[PDB]
Design an enzyme around this catalytic site. Structure first.
Site, PDB file in Angstrom:
ATOM      1  N   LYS A  13       1.146  -1.435  -0.201  1.00  0.00           N
ATOM      2  CA  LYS A  13       0.168   0.069  -0.242  1.00  0.00           C
ATOM      3  C   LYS A  13       0.794   1.329  -0.134  1.00  0.00           C
ATOM      4  CE  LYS A  13      -0.637  -0.192   4.948  1.00  0.00           C
ATOM      5  NZ  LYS A  13       0.320  -0.002   5.720  1.00  0.00           N
ATOM      6  N   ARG A  88      -6.275  -1.241  13.332  1.00  0.00           N
ATOM      7  CA  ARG A  88      -5.878  -2.806  13.171  1.00  0.00           C
ATOM      8  C   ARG A  88      -7.246  -3.417  13.130  1.00  0.00           C
ATOM      9  NH1 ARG A  88      -1.281   0.178  13.820  1.00  0.00           N
ATOM     10  NH2 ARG A  88      -1.218  -0.164  16.356  1.00  0.00           N
ATOM     11  N   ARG A 123      12.266 -12.671  -3.502  1.00  0.00           N
ATOM     12  CA  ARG A 123      13.301 -11.676  -2.635  1.00  0.00           C
ATOM     13  C   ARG A 123      14.715 -12.485  -2.472  1.00  0.00           C
ATOM     14  NH1 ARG A 123      10.991  -8.067   2.037  1.00  0.00           N
ATOM     15  NH2 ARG A 123       8.554  -7.605   0.760  1.00  0.00           N
ATOM     16  N   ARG A 156      15.839 -13.302   3.596  1.00  0.00           N
ATOM     17  CA  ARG A 156      15.854 -13.340   5.141  1.00  0.00           C
ATOM     18  C   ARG A 156      14.594 -13.993   5.089  1.00  0.00           C
ATOM     19  NH1 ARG A 156      17.433  -7.770   4.776  1.00  0.00           N
ATOM     20  NH2 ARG A 156      17.030  -6.994   2.825  1.00  0.00           N
ATOM     21  N   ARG A 167       1.616 -14.535   9.091  1.00  0.00           N
ATOM     22  CA  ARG A 167       1.755 -12.951   9.498  1.00  0.00           C
ATOM     23  C   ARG A 167       0.417 -12.869   8.036  1.00  0.00           C
ATOM     24  NH1 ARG A 167       5.956 -10.728   6.219  1.00  0.00           N
ATOM     25  NH2 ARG A 167       7.104 -11.609   7.991  1.00  0.00           N
TER      26      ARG A 167
HETATM   27 CL    CL Z   1       3.360  -3.776   2.171  1.00  0.00          CL
END
Ligand code: CL
Ligand code: CL
Ligand code: CL
Ligand code: MG
Ligand code: MG
Ligand code: NA
Length: 214
Positions: A13, A88, A123, A156, A167
């Site tokens: 976002k 949230r 990544r 990572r 998540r």
């Molecule tokens: Cl993000």
């Protein structure tokens, strides 16, 4: 314009934040940045927040809302604000309403979970320098190796697929009721709500936001 910008971790976002800031002349604000700032300021809320954090304790909704209220009273929020990633939960949105903090637009930046995963697990990093690559969007010159040193790239721990998916699962279980909350608020005329298709090119999302916001 007062805008809330919501989005799952990894959806991107943030790619639209500067566009919104420049369109309206408004700062980007976040509960994370507020905690770090108020501590510097030596204000009373900052001290209360510093105490809580130093004890490794959770910042209550009451304290977060008081910090939001204080942040948007500052001169740089005269034209509005871009509130990034908060509320949230429904209890936090209700505490906003109890405090008198309404916004003009709630924007849900939506990217399907599978596309978020595919973005992050591609990544690659050269950890000694923080140089970053991506198998599909910015690949290195020699396969799997850092352009500059020739050392083999890594990933990572933050970006492991099981961790990303966990998540996202947690994010949607918390955020689904909040989306419904703001859709209902829009039906009541208290705000406007829009689901934004974050999968399109940045320039197309920007055009879509221009239609949503005017
Ligand atoms: Cl993000
Ligand atoms: Cl802030
Ligand atoms: Cl090179
Ligand atoms: Mg600031
Ligand atoms: Mg959804
Ligand atoms: Na008010």
């Amino acid at each position: 314009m007062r805008i809330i910008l919501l989005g799952a971790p990894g959806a991107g976002k943030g790619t639209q934040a500067q566009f919104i800031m420049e369109k309206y002349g408004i700062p980007q604000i976040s509960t994370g940045d507020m905690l770090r700032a108020a501590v510097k300021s030596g204000s009373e809320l900052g001290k209360q927040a510093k105490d809580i954090m130093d004890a490794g304790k959770l910042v209550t909704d009451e304290l977060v809302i008081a910090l939001v209220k204080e942040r948007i009273a500052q001169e740089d929020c005269r034209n509005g604000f871009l509130l990034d990633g908060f509320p949230r939960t429904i209890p936090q949105a209700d505490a906003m309403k109890e405090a008198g903090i309404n916004v003009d637009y709630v924007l849900e930046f939506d990217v399907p979970d599978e596309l978020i995963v595919d973005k992050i697990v591609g990544r690659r990093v050269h950890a000694p320098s923080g140089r970053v690559y991506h198998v599909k969007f910015n690949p290195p010159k020699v396969e799997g190796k850092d352009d500059v040193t020739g050392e083999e790239l890594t990933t990572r721990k933050d970006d492991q697929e099981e961790t990303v998916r966990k998540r996202l699962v947690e994010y949607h279980q918390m955020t689904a009721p909040l989306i419904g909350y703001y859709s209902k608020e829009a039906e009541a005329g208290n705000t406007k709500y829009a689901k934004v298709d974050g999968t399109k090119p940045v320039a197309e999302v920007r055009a879509d936001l221009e239609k949503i916001l005017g």
